[PDB]
Nucleic acid binder design. Structure first.
Ligand SMILES: Nc1ncnc2c1ncn2[C@H]1C[C@H](O)[C@@H](COP(=O)(O)OP(=O)(O)OP(=O)(O)O)O1
Ligand SMILES: [Mn+2]
Ligand SMILES: [Zn+2]
Length: 1028
DNA sequence: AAAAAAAAAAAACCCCCCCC
DNA sequence: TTTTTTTTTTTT
DNA sequence: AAAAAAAAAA
RNA sequence: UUUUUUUUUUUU
């Protein structure tokens, strides 16, 4: 039983201070020059573990002191009664039993109330409860049925255990000592070498600021390593741990020896989805490292990520910051299309996946690669230190296995493992790119050979009968030195051949199974014929979404919960599909997706709130609603950003097939329009992107051709037949846009650097640039204030969050007129609401309470969600419009909520409660029903209390919506007490107690003063707060 | 000539919260 | 009464 | 410019 | 039940 740190223990103030004092005292009394700092850090970890155990035991003992004394007294009195029975002893025993039972009941009630409060704070939001409700039951780590060596099913725990441990020990024991072959392979091919500056950047001395940056970036709510310390321990005791962690890492840099804890890790076997559980090779051995080892490896990973852009080509986008997965997906789709349009089809596209990508990678080959990449000195010495004697023990069925060495492979679950694996696999990538014998597919003026995402490598070949053989020979050579293994049972290949004999020979020699219809690549069904992309990618997407809706039909969550479910689960999948393949989708797809989503949201019933109302911003609603057409436009127009940027790493841009003006995509945005050129007959992604960008620009009624962000390289300047050296000079000196050099009277005059730039340009081109720039049309078209749409694609140098900004701008642009239900409320009371009243009602809807249940109730009240006798009488085309619950009056919404003689006494009680709170609030239905206040009620010190009372009243009114019995004050008070308990524990957990007490103390005291003792005891209503 | 916006007509299902 | 779907008109 | 959560890929 | 990259949503 390995100890683990409980995060709730770190939130205790006394334990916090005691543990900080212990850390400081120990680490200033045990620090000396008679011992190394690695063993000192290990001893510090052991001492912290022991002190934490002692503190937890002390806390448990103190928390149960009163009950322990009571139970001791009860047992003693019971023994005395058994020996000699007395009446007073019986009375004392009964009283002690009653007190003990009351204390235990209070403790359990507090526990369940804390749990209910935590759930109620995130009842319908995008959070762990909703995702857990979506997901199936959590799979336990109890693997009990696994194939043995002799081919028979076994269930004996000892045999199961020994089979797993022996298999994984064998997996991590095969270390190759053929150093000469590795050196030869590295020397054969050319690899990048870091210069002196980058090497000194890697080997720079560690600073405490790096420790803080890494500690703050550590993910929370993650399982601790074998040492049992969580990331929260390092984040919370950060102030006293950065100096000693920094000194330990300095000792590591001077000596190169790591603490013994840095090596030990625990391997947890997750079953791989879509694979057979009973197979022992079908488990992913992730490793939980100590958070300090994770800190060191994350420092190292950041240091190498500083230069990962130079170390690794742009063909590889897995684990590489700043490049998306669809970079390779669109590129492969374009290559497939180019093959399909090829008159002679002699191409192959092999999707190769590495079997156990960096579980079979070689540490010696990795070290040799790092040496060959210029990585040497302190950084490489630390890298060699962390791979010196790795050791992992499998945590199997909750039992720690005896540890085995990691003589081979790279530990999974390590911050540095992806970067090092990418570095090692880049040797093979550059070998493939640099081997002229294997031929890539010549798309336009560029050659395309390979694209990588982690170990998912796709190779495009021409003349495959020799290219595939040479690629296999190269991969075998790489395997002989690095242990890289091809996952034959997952690797596939599209083989385009017009000769049956050559094709049959290729399947005869090639081990890859030739996919005839589709290849699953990064969750995307790459198609052999590119016209099948919609039918093999989006029709399955609709089928999957329909199945998920059918599975969630009986889910126990409301319409807000279902909207957030669609956002949390369905929406990312749709967005990923749109990003990977932004092909022109038929409107049938969007209508079907919207119908499925809306049927899911409203439980296959009629929509209570119009989808046009929810599709607006959160102002009209407060929870909004996904717009899949607008999201599709956002993803398809995001390519405009990559067009404008015109980066050298965007190969997926240039592989689009084209016959007229091949270099056109960089000259389309904020650039002169074509002369009705019929470019892009059959392009798949870029033509639709351009059409949608132009449509959006037309919708904005803005000129997208001559823009303040028009480049100097743009066709506007190029068509002047100016020398490209002038464009280079203007880009280097002044800037990249026309504004940077000025137009009109501002032509090369706003900056003294313009005078120097003028001397570097030919006078003919200077004259022509002056003539173009000082023209009236150019001056008015360029010297104008840019819009948000233009700023999205031009002023942002990073592609992070392009979809969100573009989608928000599109939701602003495509805003649709909707019928405001607040105006219907105004018509209901025969009174007029101003713009200020509408804003107040919408804001009250937005932030009546933090919890989404209270907000959902307020939204349903204000947005006329509830069903009424008048409305239902209309739907059934009957005449039963009489109010429910029985009054003889017409059942409008204002009647059901406010004016009914049955609900009216509840509102009179609410107003009495308001009255003894010294609140003079007018008897206006708008005040509770929508939160609309008179203009003179500017004071907000009573807003929250009134909101709580009114919304609890709405809750208890909806509780008995058509019930002939009238809503009562007691149920309203019970709902208020439930809300009070929830917000009390929420404030206790979220450190927001003062504001909660400010808006809940007087109301609670009046509740207690207006309730009898019998009601308080029966309904469990009592004060949770004191005098503070 | 095709895409997008707007207006008119029809159909809905007499509770509503709660439900981790 | 309110929402959705269809349809007819207008504009690029 | 922060935090939290979810999801996709590996 | 870990790691990297990316994406979105919500709260400011
Ligand atoms: N859930 C995960 N947690 C941690 N690391 C992961 C996870 N999924 C994938 N990886 C990392 C480690 C793998 O070596 C690497 C490549 O993933 P992947 O190709 O799916 O599997 P794999 O190469 O480990 O084995 P196999 O190809 O036999 O399924 O990505
Ligand atoms: Mn793999
Ligand atoms: Zn009534």
């Amino acid at each position: 039983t390995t100890w683990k740190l409980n995060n709730l223990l770190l939130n205790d103030y006394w334990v916090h201070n005691e543990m900080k004092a212990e850390i400081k005292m120990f680490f200033e009394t045990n620090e000396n020059k008679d011992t190394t700092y690695q063993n000192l850090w290990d001893a510090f970890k052991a001492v912290c573990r022991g002190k934490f155990i002692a503190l937890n035991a002390y806390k448990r003992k103190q928390e149960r002191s009163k009950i322990d004394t009571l139970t001791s007294q009860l047992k003693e009195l019971e023994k005395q009664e058994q020996t000699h029975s007395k009446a007073s002893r019986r009375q004392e025993i009964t009283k002690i039993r009653a007190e003990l039972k009351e204390i235990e009941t209070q403790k359990t009630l507090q526990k369940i109330n804390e749990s209910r409060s935590w759930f109620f704070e995130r009842i319908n939001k995008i959070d762990r409860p909703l995702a857990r409700l979506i997901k199936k039951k959590r799979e336990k780590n109890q693997i009990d049925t696994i194939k043995n060596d002799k081919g028979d099913i076994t269930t004996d725990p000892t045999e199961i255990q020994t089979t797993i441990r022996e298999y994984y020990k064998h997996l991590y024991a095969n270390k190759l000592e053929n150093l000469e072959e590795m050196d030869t392979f590295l020397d054969t091919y050319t690899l990048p070498r870091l210069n002196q500056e980058e090497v000194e950047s890697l080997n720079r001395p560690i600073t405490g600021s790096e420790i803080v940056a890494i500690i703050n970036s550590l993910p929370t709510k993650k399982s601790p390593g074998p040492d049992g310390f969580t990331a929260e321990f390092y984040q919370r005791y950060k102030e006293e741990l950065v100096p000693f962690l920094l000194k330990l890492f300095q000792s590591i840099e001077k000596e190169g020896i790591l603490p013994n804890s840095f090596y030990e890790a625990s391997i947890i076997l997750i079953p791989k989805p879509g694979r057979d559980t009973t197979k022992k090779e079908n488990f992913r051995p992730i490793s939980l490292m100590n958070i300090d080892a994770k800190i060191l490896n994350k420092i190292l990973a950041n240091r190498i990520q500083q230069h990962i852009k130079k170390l690794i080509h742009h063909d590889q986008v897995g684990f590489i910051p700043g490049m998306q997965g669809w970079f390779n997906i669109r590129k492969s789709i374009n290559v497939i299309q180019h093959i399909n349009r090829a008159k002679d089809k002699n191409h192959m596209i092999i999707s190769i996946d590495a079997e156990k990508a960096f579980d079979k990678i070689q540490q010696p080959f990795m070290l040799k690669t790092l040496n060959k990449l210029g990585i040497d000195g302190t950084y490489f010495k630390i890298i060699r230190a962390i791979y010196d004697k790795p050791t992992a023990n499998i945590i199997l069925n909750g039992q720690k296995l005896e540890a085995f060495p990691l003589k081979t492979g790279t530990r999974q679950g390590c911050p540095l493992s992806p970067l090092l694996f990418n570095i090692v696999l880049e040797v093979l990538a550059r070998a493939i790119r640099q081997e002229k014998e294997i031929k890539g597919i010549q798309l336009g003026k560029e050659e395309v050979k390979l694209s990588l995402f982690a170990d998912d490598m796709i190779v495009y070949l021409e003349n495959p009968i020799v290219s595939a053989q040479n690629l296999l020979k190269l991969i075998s050579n790489f395997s002989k030195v690095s242990g890289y293994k091809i996952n034959v049972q997952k690797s596939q290949a599209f083989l385009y051949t017009n000769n049956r004999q050559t094709e049959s020979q290729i399947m005869g020699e090639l081990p890859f199974t030739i996919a005839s219809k589709r290849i699953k690549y990064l969750g995307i069904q790459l198609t052999r014929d590119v016209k099948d992309l919609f039918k093999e990618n989006y029709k399955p997407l609709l089928k999957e979404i329909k199945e998920e809706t059918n599975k969630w039909k009986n889910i126990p969550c409301s319409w807000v919960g279902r909207i957030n479910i669609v956002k949390m689960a369905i929406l990312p999948k749709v967005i990923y599909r749109f990003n990977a393949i932004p092909i022109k989708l038929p409107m049938t797809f969007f209508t079907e997706l919207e119908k499925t989503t809306l049927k899911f949201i409203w439980n296959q019933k009629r929509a209570r709130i119009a989808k046009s109302i929810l599709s607006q911003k959160n102002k009209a609603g407060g929870i909004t609603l996904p717009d899949f057409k607008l999201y599709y436009k956002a993803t398809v127009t995001k390519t405009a950003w990559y067009w404008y940027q015109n980066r050298d790493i965007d190969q997926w841009n240039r592989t689009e097939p084209s016959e007229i003006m091949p270099h056109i995509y960089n000259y389309l945005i904020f650039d002169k329009p074509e002369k009705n050129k019929q470019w892009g007959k059959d392009s798949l992604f870029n033509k639709w992107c351009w059409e949608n960008w132009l449509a959006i620009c037309r919708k904005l009624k803005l000129d997208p051709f001559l823009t303040p962000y028009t480049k100097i390289n743009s066709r506007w300047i190029k068509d002047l037949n100016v020398k490209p050296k002038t464009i280079k000079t203007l880009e280097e000196n002044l800037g990249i846009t026309i504004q940077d050099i000025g137009v009109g009277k501002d032509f090369m005059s706003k900056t003294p650097k313009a005078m120097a730039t003028k001397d570097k340009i030919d006078k003919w081109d200077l004259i022509k640039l002056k003539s173009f720039c000082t023209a009236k049309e150019t001056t008015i078209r360029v010297n104008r204030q840019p819009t948000t749409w233009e700023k999205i694609f031009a002023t942002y140098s990073s592609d992070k969050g392009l979809i969100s900004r573009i989608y928000n701008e599109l939701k602003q642009i495509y805003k649709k007129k909707t019928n405001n239900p607040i105006k219907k409320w105004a018509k209901d009371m025969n009174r007029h609401f101003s713009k200020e009243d509408i804003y107040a009602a919408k804001k009250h809807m937005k932030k009546c309470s933090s919890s989404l249940a209270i907000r959902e109730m307020q939204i349903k009240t204000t947005m006329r969600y509830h069903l009424t006798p008048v409305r239902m009488a209309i739907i059934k085309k009957s005449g039963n419009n009489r109010c429910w619950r029985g009054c003889g009056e017409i059942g409008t919404l204002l009647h059901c909520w406010w004016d009914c003689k049955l609900v009216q006494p509840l509102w009179k009680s609410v107003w009495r409660f308001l009255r003894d709170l010294e609140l003079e609030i007018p008897f206006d239905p708008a005040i509770p029903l929508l939160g609309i206040y008179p203009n003179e009620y500017k004071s907000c010190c009573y807003k929250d209390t009134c909101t709580r009372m009114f919304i609890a009243a709405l809750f208890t009114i909806a509780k008995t919506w058509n019930q002939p019995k009238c809503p009562t004050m007691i149920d309203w008070i019970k709902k208020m007490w439930h809300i009070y308990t929830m917000e009390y524990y929420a404030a206790i957990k979220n450190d927001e107690f003062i504001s909660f007490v400010g808006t809940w103390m007087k109301l609670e005291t009046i509740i207690l003063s207006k309730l009898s003792q019998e009601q308080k005891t029966k309904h469990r209503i009592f004060s949770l707060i004191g005098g503070n």
